[PDB]
Amino acid sequence: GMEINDHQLSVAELEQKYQTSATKGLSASLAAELLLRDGPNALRPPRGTPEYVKFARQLAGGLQCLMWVAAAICLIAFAIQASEGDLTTDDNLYLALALIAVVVVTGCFGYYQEFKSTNIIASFKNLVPQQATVIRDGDKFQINADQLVVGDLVEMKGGDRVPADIRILQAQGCKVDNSSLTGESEPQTRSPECTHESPLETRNIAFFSTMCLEGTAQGLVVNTGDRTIIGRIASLASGVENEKTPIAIEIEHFVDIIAGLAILFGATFFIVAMCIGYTFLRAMVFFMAIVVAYVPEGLLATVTVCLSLTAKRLASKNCVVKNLEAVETLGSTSVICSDKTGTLTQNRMTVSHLWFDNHIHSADTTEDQSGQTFDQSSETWRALCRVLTLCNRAAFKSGQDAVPVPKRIVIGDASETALLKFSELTLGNAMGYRERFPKVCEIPFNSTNKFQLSIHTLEDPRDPRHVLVMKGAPERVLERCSSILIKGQELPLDEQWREAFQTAYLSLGGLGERVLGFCQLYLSEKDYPPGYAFDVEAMNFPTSGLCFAGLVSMIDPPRATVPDAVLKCRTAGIRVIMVTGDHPITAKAIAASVGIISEGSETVEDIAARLRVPVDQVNRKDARACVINGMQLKDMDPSELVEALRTHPEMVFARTSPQQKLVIVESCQRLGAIVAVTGDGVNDSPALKKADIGVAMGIAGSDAAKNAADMILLDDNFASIVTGVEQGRLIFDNLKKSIAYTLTKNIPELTPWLIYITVSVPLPLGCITILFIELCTDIFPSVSLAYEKAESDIMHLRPRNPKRDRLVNEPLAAYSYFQIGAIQSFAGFTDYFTAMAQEGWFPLLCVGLRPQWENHHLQDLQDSYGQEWTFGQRLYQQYTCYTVFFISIEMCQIADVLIRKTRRLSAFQQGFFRNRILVIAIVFQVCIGCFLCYCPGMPNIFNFMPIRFQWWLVPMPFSLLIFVYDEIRKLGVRCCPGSWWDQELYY
Amino acid sequence: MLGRTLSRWVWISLYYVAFYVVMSGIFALCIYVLMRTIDPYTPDYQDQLKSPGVTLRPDVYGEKGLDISYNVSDSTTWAGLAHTLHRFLAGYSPAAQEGSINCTSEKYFFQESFLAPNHTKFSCKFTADMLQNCSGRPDPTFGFAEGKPCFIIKMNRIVKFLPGNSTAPRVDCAFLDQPRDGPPLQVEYFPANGTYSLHYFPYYGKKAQPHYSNPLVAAKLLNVPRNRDVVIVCKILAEHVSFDNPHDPYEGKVEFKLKIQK
Ligand SMILES: CCCCCCCC/C=C\CCCCCCCC(=O)OC[C@H](COP(=O)(O)OCC[N+](C)(C)C)OC(=O)CCCCCCC/C=C/CCCCCCCC
Ligand SMILES: CCCCCCCC/C=C\CCCCCCCC(=O)OC[C@H](COP(=O)(O)OCC[N+](C)(C)C)OC(=O)CCCCCCC/C=C\CCCCCCCC
Ligand SMILES: CCCCCCCCCCCCOCCOCCOCCOCCOCCOCCOCCOCCO
Ligand SMILES: CC(C)CCC[C@@H](C)[C@H]1CC[C@H]2[C@@H]3CC=C4C[C@@H](O)CC[C@]4(C)[C@H]3CC[C@]12C
Ligand SMILES: *[C@@H]1O[C@H](CO)[C@@H](O)[C@H](O)[C@H]1NC(C)=O
Ligand SMILES: *[C@@H]1O[C@H](CO)[C@@H](O)[C@H](O)[C@H]1NC(C)=O
Ligand SMILES: *[C@@H]1O[C@H](CO)[C@@H](O)[C@H](O)[C@H]1NC(C)=O
Ligand SMILES: *[C@@H]1O[C@H](CO)[C@@H](O)[C@H](O)[C@H]1NC(C)=O
Ligand SMILES: *[C@@H]1O[C@H](CO)[C@@H](O)[C@H](O)[C@H]1NC(C)=O
Ligand SMILES: [Mg+2]
Ligand SMILES: [Rb+]
Ligand SMILES: [Rb+]
Ligand SMILES: [Rb+]
Ligand SMILES: [Rb+]
Ligand SMILES: [Rb+]
Ligand SMILES: [Rb+]
C-alpha cells in the first residue's frame, strides 16, 4: 500500500487499478468521490502540544514538587497561624512566596532552554507546489495541487514542481531534481520505461516535492498527501519520539537521587518528631524545613547558567545551538553518522585529476586552494589547457571579481562550470584568453554527435591557421583520434597508447570520478585559408584523425577542513560512519580521501581482488572497511546489520534512503552508542531528528535539515564538530565540579535542623538565610567552575561510558555530603556555641532550652550567668546564631570551590589563581556577605547580624582542614591508582 | 553482594567511623577550649543586653501582650491574680532573703573581693515588707478587692549594668492614650517614688551573688475606671535605660491591658 509498485504495471493494469483513462483522465465525479475518500493531497501537520503545556510540565519534576509541597505547608501554616490571630508568623507567607518564585523561575529556566520552538512540516510544505495541470473528462485545466487524487492524469513541464507522486506515461526530454530523496541534485531522466525494481530508482516515477528541471511529461497520480515519499520523509522527521538528551538523562538522574534522599530525611524525622513529643502540625513544619534545607533550591539554575556560558563560547566559533542540552551531547558522542554530499563535500563538481604525458596528475580541489597542485611546465599541458579552455561554453556572470573562483556563479551545466572554474584558477582569465582566440565555428554537445566541437582563429598575428578543439566521452573522443601528445612530441596512436589510455580512463572511473577526453587538430592555410567558410551542416571540416591531448576527471571534493576534523574525531575515540544517498564508488573514494577509510584498509571485495580469489572465500574479519548499498541494506536482517557494524570499524553506507539513514542511526543507538548526525539535506532530516544530536550545515543546509537539527554550523566549517567534542567533554567535567560544590553545603544546611529537632537547642539556621546561601552567595562561585580548564588531555580520551560514568555518582555524593559537608557542619556548630557562650549561653544550657527560648510569655529568661533576657533580645541572639552559621558555611565554601577546581591534580601545580572568574566569584561572595551582615537595617529585613571578627575566624581552621584533606586525598589517588584509596575516595 | 563485597562494606564503614570519631573529637576539644576561654563571673559580650527588659506580676497574657481582666464582685475572678502575686513574693520573705544582707548605702554596692560565704559577693536584701500596702499585708488581696490593684514591676538584671547614679531609677506608670473622658492615671508607688535603691547594682551574676534578688516596685493604680478597657504603660526612668525600641515592647517599659469589671 505504502510501497509504489505502479512502475511495474501496464497501462491496462493502471487504468483498471485506478479506474481512470491514461489519455482523458478521471471523471470529475469520481475525482470528487476520491477527494472525499482520501482528503486533500496535502501533508498533515502534526502539531506539538500547546506552548503553555510546555511550561506547565516545566513546573513539575522532583525538586519542583518538593518545593511545591513545602510552599503548601508554609501556606497551611500561615493560614492556621493567621486564623488564631498570631502576627509573628508571616515568615511562612514570605517563605511560600519565595519557594513559589523559585519553582516558577526554575521552570522558566527549563522552558527557555529551547530557543526556537519551530515546526518542521512548515518547511516541508514550502517544498510543495500550489498548482497543477490535470486532465479530467478530456478537459485539461489547472487546479490546486491539494485537489489531486490518486488516479488523476497530470501534466508536468520544466520549471514547475511535481504535484504528487506520479507514474509516468508520456515524456519528452524530461529531467527532475531528486535531492530531497538522495541529497544529490544531479538531474535524472524521466521516461515511461520501467528501469529498476525500486520505485526510488526507476525512470517512470516522479515525486511530489521535486522539481522538473526540463522537458515535459504526463502521468498517473499514484500517491498523494502523507503517502507520498516526501510525506513519509516528513512523517519520519516529525513523528520521532521525544527521547531525552544524554545530559537530560544525567540531570533527571541526580534529581531522582536528591528527591529520594529529601523524602527520606523529611519522613524519618517527622516520624522521630512525633515519637519525641511534638504535635502533628509541628512535625509537618519540620518536614517542610528539612526539605527546604536539604534540597538545593539553586541547583538547576546554576546548571543552565553553565550550559549557557558554553553555548556562548560555541556561538563565538559560528556554532549555534538550538537548545542548551545540545551544548553537551557531542562530548558524549561515540558514533558520528555523516552525510557526504555538501556535508563532508562541497556539493560542487571540481576538476580532480588529469591524464597526460602518460601520467595521472592530481589537481588541488580545496575551496581555498590551500592544498597540493600539479605540474604545469609541460607543453602537452599547455595544449590540453588550451583545449579545455576554448571548448567551453559557460561563462561567469558579470561583476563577481571580488568573489572567490569556487563561489562564483556560472551559466552552464555542472561539468562546464567546473572546467571554467579550473581554467580561471590555473591560467589567468578564462573568458579573456577565450576571447583572444575567436570562435569561427561551433557545434554544442549533442546526443547525436556525442561530442562538442569548435574551430578557432589563433591569436598570433603571424600564424594563419585554425585550431579545432573537441571534448567528450573518452572512448568516443579516442575513436576519432590518430595521434597523441606525449612529452613534447606527437606520436601515432599505436596499440600500446590505446591500452595506456584505457587503463588510465578506467582508473579514474574507479575513483568515483566522471572523465572527459580532450582532443585537438591544427588546420593549415593550404587547405583552409584565413577566411574559410566553416559551415556546420556541410561538415567541410574533418572531425577525425584528431590529436588526443588528455583526460580530465571531476568529483564532488571534500571541504578543506573536513579530513583533519575526521581524523581528530577518530583520535577522540569516536567512530565515524558515512551515510550517503550517492553512488557507492564515489562514496568509497570520498570515504578514503576524508579518512573514514584508512590507508591500507580493505573491503571484502578489495581483498578478493588482491588475491584473485572469489568473494565467497574472503574471511570477513580480515576486511577493516566495508561498503553496503541501500539494496543490500534493504535485504539484511537487523542481526546482520549489527554483525557488519561490529565486524568492520570503517563503514560506508551508500545509496541509502532517508528511512535507511534513520535505521542506521538507531541501530548504533540500540548497541549503546550516543549518536550524532551531520547533514545538510531534506533526505537527512529523519536521521537528524533521531540522532542524540543533529548538526546541520548553516550555508549549504536546506530548511528541513536545519529545523530538524539541534546545532547549526553557521560557516559550514566541519572542524567545528571537533570544537564541540571538546566543549562537551569540558562542560561535563566542570558541571560535576559545579554540582559537587553546590550539594556540599546542603548538609550544614540540614544538620542544624536535625539537632534543633532532636536536641531542642535554639534554632541555629533559619530558612530565609538558607535560601540566601542557595540563591545568592554561593551561585557565582559555582558558576565560575564552568571556566575550569581541562585537567588531562581530554581530546585523546575515549568517549565516556554512558552507563558507568555519570554526572553525580555515589562517590561524588557521599564525599560531598558525609565528609566535607560534615566538616562544614562541625564548623557551623563550633561557631554557634562560641557565639552563644560569649553572649552568655553555655552549651549545656542550650540543650533543651528551645521552649523557653521561643516563649513570648517569657521576657526574663535567665542565661548561664543569671542575666535576664526578653523574647526580643533572645530573638536577635538567634539571628546572630543564623549569621554565625552562615559565615561558617561561606568560609567553608571558599575552600570548597578551591578544592573542586581539580578532581585529580593538586592545586599546587595548576595554582589557585589561573581561573580568574573564580577569584572574582570568591571576592563577590565575600562582599555580598559583608553587605548582608553590616548594612544597617539587615537585622529586621533578612535577619543578619553584624557579627564580630572572631566568629569570622572561628570556622577558618575547618576550611583550611577541608583544603588539606582534599589535597591529601588527591595526592593519594595520584600516587596509588590501583589502591583502595583510589577505588573508594576518588570522585 | 549487597552493593559492595562484605569486606569492602566493613572497610568503608570503619573509615567513616574513624572519620566521625576524629571530627567529633576535634569538635569536643573546640568546646573544651571554648569553656576554658570563658570566665564564670562576667559574660564576654553583652550585645543584646544594651538596655534591660521590664516584666510585671501578675503576668497574664491575652494574645499579643499582657491582658488582665477581673470582676470586683466575683472574688474568684481575681483569686488567681492575688495567688500568683503571693507566690511570686514567697521568695522575698525574710526567711528566703537570709542569704542577703541589709544594705543602707543608697549607693552602688561595688565589691571586688569575695567576703561572703563560700567565695561569694554580698547581695542586698529585698523583703516583701518594703512593698508596704502592696506586700500582701494588711491587705492580702493586693489592692484587687477594692478595685485599686497592685502590679509589681521588675527590671531584668544584667551583669555590671549601671542604670545611672544621679538618683535612683524610678518607675512611672500612666495611660497609653490618656482618655479625653478622664484625668491622668493616679498611682502610689512602693517604695516611695517607685525607686530601685542604687545598692542593688551592679549585679555580679548568679555565681557571684547566688542569693541575689531583684529589687521590686509596686504600682498601686487608684484612678482606673470600671467596665472600661484601658492600656497602662510603665516605664523605667534612668540615665542608662531606654524604652524607645519598636522591636522590643519589653525594653525599658512594660505595657498591659486592664479591665476591672464591676
Ligand atoms: C553522623 C554522626 C554524627 C555524630 C555527631 C556527634 C556530635 C557530638 C560531638 C561531641 C559531643 C559534645 C562534646 C562536648 C565536649 C565537652 C568538653 C568540655 O569539657 O567542656 C565543658 C562543658 C561543660 O561546661 P562547664 O560546666 O565546664 O562550664 C563552666 C565554665 N567554666 C569551665 C569556665 C567554669 O561540657 C559540656 O558543655 C557538656 C555538654 C556538651 C554540649 C552538647 C552540645 C550538643 C550539640 C551537638 C551538635 C553537634 C553537631 C555535629 C554535626 C555533625 C555533622 C554530620
Ligand atoms: C522509623 C524511623 C526511625 C524512627 C526513630 C525513633 C527513635 C526513637 C524515638 C523515640 C525514643 C525516645 C522517647 C522518649 C520518651 C518519650 C518522650 C516524650 O514523651 O516527650 C517529652 C519530651 C518532649 O516533650 P516536652 O517534655 O518537651 O514538652 C513539655 C511541654 N512543656 C515544655 C510545656 C513542659 O521529650 C524530650 O524533649 C526529651 C527526649 C529527648 C530524646 C531524643 C532522642 C533522639 C530521637 C531520635 C533520633 C534518632 C534518629 C534516627 C535516624 C535514622 C534515619 C535512617
Ligand atoms: C585554602 C584556604 C581556606 C581558608 C579560607 C580563608 C578565607 C579568607 C576570606 C577573607 C575574609 C575577610 O574577612 C572580613 C571580615 O570582616 C569582619 C569585620 O569585623 C568587624 C568587627 O566588628 C564587630 C561588630 O561590632 C558590633 C557593634 O558595632 C558597633 C559599632 O558600629 C560602627 C559601624 O559598624 C557597623 C558594624 O560593625
Ligand atoms: C558515624 C556513625 C554514628 C554513623 C555510622 C552509620 C553508617 C552505617 C553510615 C554512616 C556513613 C554511611 C556511608 C556514607 C557514604 C557511603 C558511600 C556511598 O557510595 C554509599 C553509601 C555509603 C557507604 C554510606 C553507608 C552507610 C554509612 C557507612
Ligand atoms: C556554701 O555556702 C552557702 C552559703 O550561701 C552555704 O549555705 C552552704 O552550706 C555552703 N556549702 C558548702 C558545701 O560548704
Ligand atoms: C496604705 O496604708 C495606710 C495605712 O492603712 C493608709 O493610710 C493608706 O491610705 C494606704 N494607701 C492606699 C493607697 O490605700
Ligand atoms: C556618680 O558616679 C560617678 C562615676 O562616674 C562618681 O564619680 C560620682 O561621684 C557619683 N556621683 C553621685 C552624685 O553619686
Ligand atoms: C517623691 O517623693 C519625694 C519625697 O521623698 C517628694 O518630694 C516628691 O514630690 C515625690 N515625687 C512624686 C512624683 O510624687
Ligand atoms: C460581676 O459579678 C456579678 C455577680 O456574680 C455579676 O452580676 C456581674 O455581671 C459581674 N460583672 C460583669 C461585668 O459581668
Ligand atoms: Mg547532502
Ligand atoms: Rb538548601
Ligand atoms: Rb552553473
Ligand atoms: Rb590569426
Ligand atoms: Rb542542501
Ligand atoms: Rb535530535
Ligand atoms: Rb533523538
Author numbering:
A (entry chain A): 47 to 1033
B (entry chain B): 29 to 290
Sentences from the paper on this structure:
The highly acidic environment (pH 1) in the stomach is generated by the gastric proton pump, H+,K+-ATPase, which mediates an exchange of H+ and K+ across the parietal cell membrane that is coupled with ATP hydrolysis. The H+,K+-ATPase consists of two subunits. The α-subunit is composed of 10 transmembrane (TM) helices, in which the cation-binding sites are located, and three cytoplasmic domains (the nucleotide (N), phosphorylation (P) and actuator (A) domains) that catalyze ATP hydrolysis and the auto-phosphorylation reaction.
Better-resolving crystals were obtained by using a Tyr799Trp mutation on the α-subunit (Y799W). We therefore conclude that Tyr799Trp prefers the luminal-closed K+-occluded state, (K+)E2-P, and is thus suitable for the structural analysis of the K+-occluded form. We analyzed several crystal structures in the presence of different combinations of K+ or Rb+, and AlFx or MgFx, all of which mimic the K+-occluded E2-P transition state and are indistinguishable in molecular conformation. The observed single K+-binding is confirmed by the anomalous difference Fourier maps of Y799W(Rb+)E2-MgFx, Y799W(Rb+)E2-AlFx and Y799W(K+)E2-MgFx structures, which unambiguously show a single strong peak at the cation binding site located between TM4, TM5 and TM6 in the middle section of the membrane. Similar results were obtained for Rb+ coordination in the Y799W(Rb+)E2-MgFx (valence 1.14) and Y799W(Rb+)E2-AlFx (valence 1.07) structures, but these results are clearly different from those previously reported for the Rb+-bound (SCH)E2BeFx structure (valence 0.39). The observed K+-independent ATPase activity of Tyr799Trp in the absence of K+ indicates that the luminal gate of this mutant is spontaneously closed, like those of the previously reported constitutively active mutants.
